[PDB]
Amino acid sequence: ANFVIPYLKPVADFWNSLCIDQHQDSLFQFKGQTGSLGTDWTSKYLRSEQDVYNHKYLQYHKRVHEAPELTDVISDNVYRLTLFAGVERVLSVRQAQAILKTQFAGATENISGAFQTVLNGGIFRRGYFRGALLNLLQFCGAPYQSLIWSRNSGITNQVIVSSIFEAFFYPLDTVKTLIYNDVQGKYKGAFHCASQVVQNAGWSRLYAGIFQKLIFNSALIFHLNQVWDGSSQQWASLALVAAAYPLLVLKTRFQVAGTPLALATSNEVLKVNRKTLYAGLVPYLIFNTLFAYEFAAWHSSTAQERVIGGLQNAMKQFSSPAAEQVWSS
């Protein structure tokens, strides 16, 4: 009670908060009435049962009609950045595996080989979560700034803003790719890697594949808008982004080339076997379809209408199935 419960209480409270409705618990905490009917326990549960969907709708509205919040965006994309942050590294390694040395280090040239190469270093900074902080910073930056500066904008304006911000923040992406593909731990950190790159090659080395990255980003933004809208052409957009994927793989190869971490240089990257230009296509598509970006700020009118209609349909379940049709209300 003096040495265990004080330290164990926070853990149990956090578990209960995760596993229980905070709003409902807060409503039930306050007991009594001040002079208005409807403050009893029975009414509060009835109110909370609808307040669930009401709060969902209010949060969605805030993400649309109010300035985007970094905490809200991170909460929306928690899975893609918190628990499955090593899939980004594994996909990058698979894309760059054509001109890497991993195939000679007990790894096959497939998604399983990329996973094994990533996991050989463990789960921490040298393993699965390597580059997780860099990915989180890049997401809290370029996508977040793009949302801030293109909230409630058309597809063209959103693509332009995202392209500009990606061009501005491109060096961070290159450093993150290098850290992902550094299997032997040559670089001790992002700053060390950037310093080595600048010292050896010119500052232009950090801007390799910028145009293909921007084109692939535009295609991905179009696909995201289509899937948010829910139109049947989302599959055609998925095929389009699949066709544009070689742009992404070329970008990764250019970023990873011209360094001891790769067997090929910038000139040789272009003349690589064309049969490996779709390395990691299916993994990338599956990962992006399962954990797509939930940018409610860029949702168009059709997406907002779809979400509101779904919430209203869910809300329509709070009536008695056997209600009698009465002549007088």
């Binding site: 007991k31 009594g32 009435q33 009917l37 403050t39 009893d40 326990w41 029975t42």
Partner: protein, 50 residues
């Protein structure tokens, strides 16, 4: 297996012994409040014997 059967038997025994404590929420409208009330149980004697 003995531990599993022991847990099942204990759970059933706890349910049976808790039966006799009749606890129910009563809603007083004057204060608009739910309060716990404890009362005895009336049941056929066969259930008590078993």
């Amino acid at each position: 297996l003995l531990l599993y059967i022991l847990w099942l038997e204990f759970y059933q025994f706890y349910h049976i012994l808790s039966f006799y404590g009749n606890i129910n929420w009563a809603f007083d409208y004057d204060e608009y409040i739910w309060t716990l009330e404890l009362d005895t149980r009336r049941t056929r004697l066969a259930n008590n014997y078993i």
